[PDB]
Design a protein around this ligand. Structure first.
Ligand SMILES: COC[C@H]1CC[C@@H]2/C1=C\[C@@]1(C)CCC(C(C)C)=C1[C@@H](O[C@H]1O[C@H](CO)[C@@H](O)[C@H](O)[C@H]1O)[C@H](O)[C@@H]2C
Ligand SMILES: COC[C@H]1CC[C@@H]2/C1=C\[C@@]1(C)CCC(C(C)C)=C1[C@@H](O[C@H]1O[C@H](CO)[C@@H](O)[C@H](O)[C@H]1O)[C@H](O)[C@@H]2C
Ligand SMILES: [Mg+2]
Ligand SMILES: [Mg+2]
Ligand SMILES: [Mg+2]
Ligand SMILES: [Mg+2]
Lengths: 6, 228, 228, 6
């Protein structure tokens, strides 16, 4: 998937 | 163009725009609230950050689609249109960075406000770095690093390891290391250490606080799984 | 502001904007293509219709959220903000209606182009009627009815009952009857008759055409299920 | 649900 950021 | 509306009305309209998923409106209402010159509360900083994160999130998603199309293409139309979207994303990041520097950061004395704004400063230079190719890609990268580093130094001194803003900061700084600075080992070590130090502090939390810390802990875990 | 770009570049940029889900850009590229003064092809009419349907679809969704919030409220902020969104949706419908009347419809001589544009004219007056309260709610409603009626008269003379534009036209005209004209019986009879006449013509179709007709037939069936 | 249009 796409890596997470917040 | 929000100079004639009351600060409280701008905030209330930003909340309405959020419910309506009108994020450009939400961001314009929040810009107008910041320009009133008073410091933001916790809830208002959250609104400001959600509005711009959504706006730039849309521009970055479109820029990736056009960049990908363009790469396959190597007429002028995809490059020109990717450039137009790129200029618009750059102007949004410049707007956010101008708000932070005039004068959200200078007036932010509490750890939770100062770290929050410094994280945003790191994020918006990181978005600029995603698209940068010039004489100043390196200075943009180092501006992101320096903002995130100052935020990290304050958070480790002033906030518990489970604090959601400290957690989100580390999550994004680790993404910066991985895909902007080409330092995957530093990205992994930062995400592992953050995760582990938060696990050991969960016991101190109420059920409410425990739920908001564990949510961002899971994104730390997602990236570690993806990267290892 | 698209007067200096080539028609073919505008069309290509509209396709790029669609892939990037930048529908306001897509609509502005298509407006600029129409203003070149040449008739649109089948594929270009589809692009124009998708761009504006998406733009107005977002405004209408937001207007319903704010209208709903406002209803519960009976300060000035929700009413004022619903009004702002309402003005913006009205300006989009006026822009589309101006394109159709200057001069897409006048130049459209083939059934598939003329019925397509007349359906759009009915749709955009119907969106105006969704928000209208004035001295002219009734004239806006009757402008929608008259556009859809002219489209229906042409389609029944010139197009097979399975033609996707004829099907979509009837689907929307039936929604107009049901929720704008308060004629649920007419809405039901129109959707049933359309569905039944298309079923009896499916046999004439290739596998490709059969798939595009049956897709809009299913929406006719969905509404009949909802309404009966 | 919401009625369909197209
Ligand atoms: C500058 O970097 C701001 C981010 C650093 C971590 C994270 C950041 C941003 C946002 C506002 C958006 C996503 C979340 C949660 C859902 C992860 C939050 C926030 O969450 C707060 O606000 C949102 C209200 O919108 C709620 O859903 C949560 O219930 C609330 O605790 C959380 O406390 C911190 C402030
Ligand atoms: C003015 O009222 C225009 C609508 C009347 C019925 C319907 C209308 C609009 C659109 C363009 C959007 C939804 C669909 C399909 C998916 C239902 C179509 C189109 O569909 C065409 O175009 C889209 C390309 O975007 C494709 O997905 C289909 O494969 C293609 O057949 C179909 O042939 C007719 C033109
Ligand atoms: Mg005041
Ligand atoms: Mg202060
Ligand atoms: Mg030319
Ligand atoms: Mg003609």
């Amino acid at each position: 998937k796409r890596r997470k950021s917040v | 163009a929000m100079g004639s509306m009351e600060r409280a009305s701008l905030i209330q309209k930003a909340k309405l725009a959020e419910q309506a998923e009108r994020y450009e409106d939400m961001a314009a209402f929040m810009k107008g609230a910041v320009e009133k010159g008073e410091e933001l509360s916790c809830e208002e900083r959250n609104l400001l950050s959600v509005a711009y994160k959504n706006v730039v999130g849309g521009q970055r998603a479109a820029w990736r689609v056009l960049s990908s199309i363009e790469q396959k293409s190597n007429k002028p139309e995809v490059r020109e249109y990717r450039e137009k979207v790129e200029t618009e994303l750059q102007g949004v990041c410049d707007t956010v960075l101008g708000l932070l520097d005039s004068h959200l950061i200078k007036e932010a004395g509490d750890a939770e406000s100062r770290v929050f704004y410094l994280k945003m400063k790191g994020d918006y230079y990181r978005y600029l770095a995603e698209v940068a190719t010039g004489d100043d890609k390196k200075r943009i990268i180092d501006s992101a690093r320096s903002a995130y580093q100052e935020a990290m130094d304050i958070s480790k001194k002033e906030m518990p390891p489970t604090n959601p803003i400290r957690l989100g900061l580390a999550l994004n700084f680790s993404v910066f290391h991985y895909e902007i600075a080409n330092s995957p080992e530093e990205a992994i070590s930062l995400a592992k250490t953050t995760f582990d130090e938060a696990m050991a502090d969960l016991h101190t939390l109420s059920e409410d606080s425990y739920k908001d810390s564990t949510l961002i802990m899971q994104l730390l875990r997602d990236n570690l799984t993806l990267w290892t």
